[PDB]
Design a protein around this ligand. Sequence first.
Ligand SMILES: *N[C@@H](Cc1ccccc1)P(=O)(O)O
Ligand SMILES: *N[C@@H](Cc1ccccc1)P(=O)(O)O
Lengths: 672, 672
Amino acid sequence: EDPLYWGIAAEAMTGSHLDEVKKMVAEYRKPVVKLGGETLTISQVAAISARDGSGVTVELSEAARAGVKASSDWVMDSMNKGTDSYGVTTGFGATSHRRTKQGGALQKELIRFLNAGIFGNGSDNTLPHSATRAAMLVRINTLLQGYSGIRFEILEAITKFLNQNITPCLPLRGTITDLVPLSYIAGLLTGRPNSKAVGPTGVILSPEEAFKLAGVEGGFFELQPKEGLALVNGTAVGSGMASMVLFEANILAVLAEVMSAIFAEVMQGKPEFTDHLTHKLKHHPGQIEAAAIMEHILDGSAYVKAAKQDRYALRTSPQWLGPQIEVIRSSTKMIEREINSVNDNPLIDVSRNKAIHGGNFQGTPIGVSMDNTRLAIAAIGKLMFAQFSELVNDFYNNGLPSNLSGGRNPSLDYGFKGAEIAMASYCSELQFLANPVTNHVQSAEQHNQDVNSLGLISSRKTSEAVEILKLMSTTFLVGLCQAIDLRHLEENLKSTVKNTVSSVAKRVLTMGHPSRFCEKDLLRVVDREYIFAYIDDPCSATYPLMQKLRQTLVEHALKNGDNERNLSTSIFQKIATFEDELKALLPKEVESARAALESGNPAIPNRIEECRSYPLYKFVRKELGTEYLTGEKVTSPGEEFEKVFIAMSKGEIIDPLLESLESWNGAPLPIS
Amino acid sequence: EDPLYWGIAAEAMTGSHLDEVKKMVAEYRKPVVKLGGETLTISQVAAISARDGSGVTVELSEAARAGVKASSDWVMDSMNKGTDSYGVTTGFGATSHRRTKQGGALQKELIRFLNAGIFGNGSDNTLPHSATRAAMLVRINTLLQGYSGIRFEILEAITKFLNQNITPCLPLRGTITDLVPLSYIAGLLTGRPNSKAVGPTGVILSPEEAFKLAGVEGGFFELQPKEGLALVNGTAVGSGMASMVLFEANILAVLAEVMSAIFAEVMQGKPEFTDHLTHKLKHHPGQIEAAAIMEHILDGSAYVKAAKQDRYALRTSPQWLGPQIEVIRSSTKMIEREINSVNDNPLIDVSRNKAIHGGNFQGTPIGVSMDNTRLAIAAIGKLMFAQFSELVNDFYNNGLPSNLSGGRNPSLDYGFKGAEIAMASYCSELQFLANPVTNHVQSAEQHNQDVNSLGLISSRKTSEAVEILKLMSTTFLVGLCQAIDLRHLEENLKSTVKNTVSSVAKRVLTMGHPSRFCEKDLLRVVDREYIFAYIDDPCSATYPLMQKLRQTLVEHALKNGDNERNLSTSIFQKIATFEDELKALLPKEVESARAALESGNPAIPNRIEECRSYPLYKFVRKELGTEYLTGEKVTSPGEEFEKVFIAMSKGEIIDPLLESLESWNGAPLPIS
Ligand SMILES: *N[C@@H](Cc1ccccc1)P(=O)(O)O
Ligand SMILES: *N[C@@H](Cc1ccccc1)P(=O)(O)O
């Protein structure tokens, strides 16, 4: 028994976040959005909001028509009897004491005075057309429930505008949540002289042109009583935009979880930070899930198979992301309820033969969910900035080059240093955007609206935060792929150094007849030393390779006892010879190895090919043609970022992201 | 000609910030604050606000009495003729349409209904008594100008309350700027039954007890027409607190400038970042002054005399602090005007025989100056956090121990690591506090007060920020003194290592008969190496001293040519002997040197004794008894922080701070 509907809401929060995202993605890709008033999802809003030629269409449920007609007939019938009804024969808001019997004239006036927005020139003060399409879809879904008193034919007209991608121009600002912007949809439907629409290629259209292109026949609508109020008195603009925002935010949270694991891989972090006991003992489900996802990536990693504590951006990443995922998930359910709500006033209850006055236009679920989600996005951004900062810092990245520089000459390759500065600027602006909107409520409309939600303004700020998080995710992802390629370079160049030191050691020290403990210790120097600390000038006397090799020969000479006092068996007398032979040979050997790797024929294959995270690397590197960055070529990091950012904004990252987890059974690895 | 008073305001911003602070400090210490209505400074407010037994007294200018009596007589005379006057025979605010001829009864009612604050139990909802004293002083200064229509005897009564440290209890909250809190001063003067005061030792007093202790004779006042409005209708609580805040903020900005220079000293930064050409070419006077002050400290530094680029918290510190100083200075002039303004309504103009209605109670200068100053305080804090972070990090602090650890065993001394975490918590809360208050205005009082300044709320938040900045300054200052002592330890232990290496080198290598290029190169190793990288275990084979000493002997052996092939002149055959003699001798020599330094008899004196910054170190170390922190003793960093924080809060840091600059002539060093 669930009289206040807490139970059905709680049921919607079972199962994993990842399974919800997989469902959202499948829903988004369906060819038809069937609207009945109560099954709209944020992924259907996101799909319809697109203006990218996907071909998705909207169709209205015929099962809804009778209820819609009933309340429309009720309103018309109550005019014929000549009663007194708010928004039908009375004024609006604080001025509702005015009376009139010109019902159609009142609705015409309503749309006129709500057309109070400012467009100016250009598009800077215009609502994005995708958000207008989202608003149109959500408004239809509300009106289909049959409590609003509007003709079904008007909903059919809005549906044609959606399906033919003919979009009314709406002002960006003007709403405290959505009378003013929704009145520009009504104005297009009634052919107001200032009404404008945009066609699929951006052409500005008159209302007559828009009706013709959309396939609306019958001329402009003449609003019947209540129909203007039914069009404008709801939360569709704020909730439609919040839906688009949350669709991307849910995906980006999964991307942040997977990139935390790929980060761990290339950093050679200790995978035990994902151990399920740690997360089980905190009970938080977002943290448990985030750990299990990272553990899944790491359990199928060829880098972990190649393995005092890691720093917090690695080791506390499940604790950090967990509550953000929970907020984004909870916020999604709030918005999904809002886009299926009857946000209108008054409500026509034909069953009780009366209009019910209330406050369902008050968009508080939008403002709250968008403020909370914006703070969650800023936190995901801050972690990404901290991880990126560790990745490019040679003090912390366990042997990767400073700046992830790629070329032979570090003096002419500063790698990701510019990107790192950009990442700080993204993170800083994201922390600014994290401030709430909903604590700035003004007592409005002659103090009739003395609380108001500010939902659309908050959705807009969260939309801006998501865009910045995509800039950060793009830059981080390209950095991770650079690091992957640097680990491949590292393993191959280390193997070449080992082989060269071994061949020289044999040839020079095979006397004093074979110095064998010496050769193995020299090889241990190579195993121990960071390749990128010396490989740009491997035989330099001031770099660690030659210094530690000599130190090893000296250590063996001091332990060589009596044999060291005979020039024929002296290890010390071999040092100058060893160093000369190595200087003559190691440079060209390192160059040949690097050239071979650059030609696609490395001695050791790139281990990423055997990792579960390979689909993301493969997509960035092979599908998108993003290239390894190097000061030896003219290509800038931004040119590579463009490829990933544009693909990300087209949804092309979704498939390789989910592919990286597709064999996960949804449970953590056993701890018993 | 200066008809809008821009010119006289601009004149107040000439001369250096430091000279203004020196004047403020002298003003604060004067024994008598003489009030005439128009010469009050923030330093006089700060001095009077103190409840620390300084003995400062207030006295009222007799020259003010005639104007005060004139407007008080005017109000009484306009009652006798029976006219209509706002706040005298009419209601208040939005209810000013009500009429009455009971003039005294109206003022009694005014104080009753404004007594709408909440104290609860304890002091958490009570205005601090120092801020109440500031408010009382500022209100007298306003009323002395003679435009308010109040009896001079009431001002004399408030003066006795100040001079005898009898303070009415005021609620902390209740004002949008200061009717509600000021009505509790009026309530004490009229003996309201709920009125309470506090004596000098905290005893709660009835109004009768308070009058007796303060020396007010004549019984409770019975307010004459307008007198209640004259007491409560002004900005004295917000501006009084802003004055106290800005007094400390001005001093702390000079402290931040000087600590930036001491930071540069102990970091061995390049002093050229203070070069006047750099700052001259930006024109900003705060930056030019901040550079010249730091340059003055550094020009008299015995550490700079002992000397690719420094990091931003050092090298951009004048650029960073400059605009903060300008904001604090500009904000000070705004508040100094406000505390000398006639913030009251209506104004009695006996010259024109009329009351002038206006808005001078609108405390916008307070809200703006306190919001801007709070952001400036957060910026000074952020720089201090960044400097402290560099100071304790061995990657960045040019040879100081990680954490500024002080004991012989770093495994049992983590120095300032706890303080560093605390500094992040201080900085984080300061950045939170930097948000403004004045963008949260509500339309208030039946929408009569549809804009309001929120000045006191903003002053309170800036007061909290200043307190945190004092926590940060205390912790940083103790860290700087720790670093000073570590540089003293460093120079002495390095000298001992050099002498020991030299004596061993002589004794062991004086054969092959004296290895002289060898000895000088071994000494160059000691000169080059960071003492704190090895001095806890100086003869360890895995530490850099023994490694680089051996490397030097090996390098000389490889250059020794034919003599190296004879065991009698072999340098390589001396290594094991050299290392054994050094291991037998260097440990006890280092210990004797450290013990001698710990006993006050170092071989090399502490160079701080010859620096211009010595007064601050001497005060912290000798006057306050703050001690060098070491894991070898039980004393915690917090115990030492307490000494400095308490002294700082008593103003005891002012004298050594200004002493460090007292020979500065106020100009930068020539660049031509
Ligand atoms: N949200 C109000 C409708 C309205 C329309 C136009 C102007 C002002 C208000 P409600 O439904 O609460 O009357
Ligand atoms: N600031 C107003 C005085 C007032 C006193 C008590 C209640 C409400 C207002 P004003 O001087 O503008 O009338």
